[PDB]
Design a protein around this ligand. Structure first.
Ligand code: NAG
Ligand code: NAG
Length: 198
């Protein structure tokens, strides 16, 4: 039975700090078919050749995705500094991963656009003298996710519950929507729970 990538093709992809995670087990995949639907600008594979990626057998296959402007590609690079790795998404390199940046063609209709691209500029607890920043663990959500989900309708809008404080930055989506996918694979327990279609 085939792995169904319909969910990422349907609806509006979330802001980066609230990325969507799809996990596939006990199914076969056709990654070429999924990727061919997008205009790929960048991609980067760690501990994989995309060939090995498109033809290997794993115990599970995880896909994280979110709306993301391609020109912010460097902030997603391994070892990068700044708000994106700090407060939004820090890639987990403990497993073979591939990061793909792509533009959604208008010919692809089921994907809808948000009004704004968005990311967190900070996530902290107030100390006594300054801010005690809280940084993303690899592959995990910001601890400011609950606050961030309150939404941002202006630039540098803040949210707090007393303890935590977050601040988001927003800007209009101009042109075709651009996205990021992080494909991750695991070699556990289950040898060939996930294999390439044939
Ligand atoms: C995977 O999808 C591609 C379309 O991009 C198609 O050409 C190919 O035949 C498919 N592979 C299998 C095994 O179905
Ligand atoms: C959208 O239409 C075709 C069919 O999917 C696609 O291959 C093509 O790249 C797109 N058209 C453009 C980009 O003008």
């Amino acid at each position: 039975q085939e792995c169904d990538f319909t969910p990422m093709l349907t609806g509006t992809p979330p802001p980066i700090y609230n990325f969507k995670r799809l996990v596939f087990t006990n199914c076969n995949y056709n990654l070429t078919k999924l990727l061919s639907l997008f205009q790929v600008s960048e991609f980067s594979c760690h501990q994989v050749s995309p060939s090995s990626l498109a033809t290997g057998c794993y115990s599970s296959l995880t896909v994280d995705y979110f709306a993301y402007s391609t020109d912010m590609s460097s902030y997603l690079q391994p070892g990068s500094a700044g708000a994106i790795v700090q407060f939004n998404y820090k890639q987990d390199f403990s497993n073979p991963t591939c990061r793909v940046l792509a533009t959604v063609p208008q010919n692809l209709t089921t994907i809808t656009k948000p009004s704004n691209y968005a990311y967190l500029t900070e996530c902290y607890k107030t100390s006594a003298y300054g801010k005690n920043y809280l940084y993303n663990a690899p592959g995990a959500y910001t601890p400011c996710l609950s606050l961030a989900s309150r939404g941002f309708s202006t630039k540098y809008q803040s949210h707090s519950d007393g303890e935590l404080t977050t601040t988001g930055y927003i800007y209009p989506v101009t042109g075709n929507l651009q996205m990021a996918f992080i494909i991750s694979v695991q070699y556990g327990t289950d040898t060939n729970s996930v294999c390439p279609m044939q």
